[PDB]
Every structure is written in structure tokens, then in C-alpha cells.
Amino acid sequence: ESFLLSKVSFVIKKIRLEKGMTQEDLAYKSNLDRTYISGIERNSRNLTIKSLELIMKGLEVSDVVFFEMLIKEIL
Amino acid sequence: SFLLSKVSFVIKKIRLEKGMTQEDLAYKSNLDRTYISGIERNSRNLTIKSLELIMKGLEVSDVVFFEMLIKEILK
DNA sequence: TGTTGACTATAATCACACA
DNA sequence: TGTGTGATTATAGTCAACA
């Protein structure tokens, strides 16, 4: 009652910090909301595919890399 | 209207690789057929939680799903 | 209940990728 | 060689009104 979503909501936080960004920066660059971005990283939002596609663009990272990094992270 | 269409392609593919109807995936993943139908028509927004249920009823891990998804991304 | 109608998947087939 | 994805007709299937 947690997995995958927890793993997806972790890589986002990993990359964002490795990119030296902020939740206010991510919410702005992905046209989303800081309250929404916050809740995700702490696993309090359901998160959709389209709402994830916006994140990778806000984080400035291709879809391929995100999933490749996602695959590793679960291991 | 891209990533949701690329994930959906893999959904029916493994469904057609494992050899099962949408009604079978609807049952095995505990989801309404109209919803399973929906995401394949392209689409319904599709939450991550629902996506996790799909893989469970698809008898495949997430790593083999994303790997297959990525292979379907590179052209 | 019974059935019409439009929107679907489904299944059989072909043909050209690819390895 | 060999399997497999794409595209195709064509059948069967779904659902959502109606009286």
C-alpha cells in the first residue's frame, strides 16, 4: 500500500535536488502548484501521467532518463 | 498528448502478449472495463496507483514494463 | 424488458520488417 | 531463414438510450 508511487515520488525529489532546484522552482517551471509538488514528494497526492510529463519538463530531463533512473531506484 | 499515449500502447501490448481481453485485465486489476477501455482509446488521465494495478493483473514487474516502455520511446 | 444504433474490441489474414 | 509488428477487413462485442 505504498510502492511505485513512493518510488516515483522519490526520484523526482532526487533529481530536483541534484539539479539544485526548489519546490517553488519546480512548480513554476512545470506550470503546477507548490502545494501540489510538496504533497507528492511526501506521498500525499495521487499523481497522474500527464502531471508527471510536466514534471520531467520542469526538471529538464527526458522521459527515457527518468524511467532508466526509476528502474535503478527500485532495485 | 504524448506520454499517456505511449504508456497506453504498452498496456494493450502486454495484454495482447499475455493473451487476455480487456475484461480479463479489468478483473485481474480490479478496475472497471470502461476505464481499461478508456486508457486504451487514449485516454483517461490515468493515475500511478491505477497503473500499478494494471501491472499486477498483467503478471509483469514494473522494471520489465518501463524497459518495454523505453524501447517503445526510442525512434 | 426487448431491441435499435453507433461505437468498440476481437479475430483471421497478409506482407514486410527486423534478427 | 525465422519471428514479429503493422495494417487490413470483418465479425462480434459493448453500452446507452428509448416505448
Residue numbers in the entry:
A (entry chain B): 2 to 76
B (entry chain A): 3 to 77
Extract from the study:
The controller protein of the type II restriction–modification (RM) system Esp1396I binds to three distinct DNA operator sequences upstream of the methyltransferase and endonuclease genes in order to regulate their expression. The plasmid-borne type II RM system Esp1396I has been well studied both in vitro and in vivo and reveals a temporal control mechanism that employs a controller protein (C-protein) encoded within the RM operon. The controller protein C.Esp1396I, and indeed all other C-proteins studied to date, have been shown to be homodimeric helix–turn–helix proteins that bind to pseudo-symmetrical DNA operator sequences. Each of these two structures, termed 19OR and 25OL, are nucleoprotein complexes comprising a C-protein dimer and a DNA duplex.
The 19OR structure includes the entire OR C-protein binding site. The 19OR crystals showed weak isotropic diffraction extending to 3 Å resolution. In the 19OR crystal structure, each protein dimer contacts four DNA duplexes and two protein subunits belonging to adjacent asymmetric units. The only clear contacts between the C-­protein and the DNA occur between the protein side chains and the phosphate groups in the DNA backbone. The overall conformation of the DNA duplex in the 19OR structure does not conform to the canonical B-form; it is significantly distorted and resembles the biologically bound conformation previously observed in the 19OL structure. The overall bend of 42° is a little less than that observed in the biologically bound OL complex (54°), but the DNA retains the reduced minor groove in the central spacer between the two C-boxes, despite the lack of significant interactions with the HTH motif.
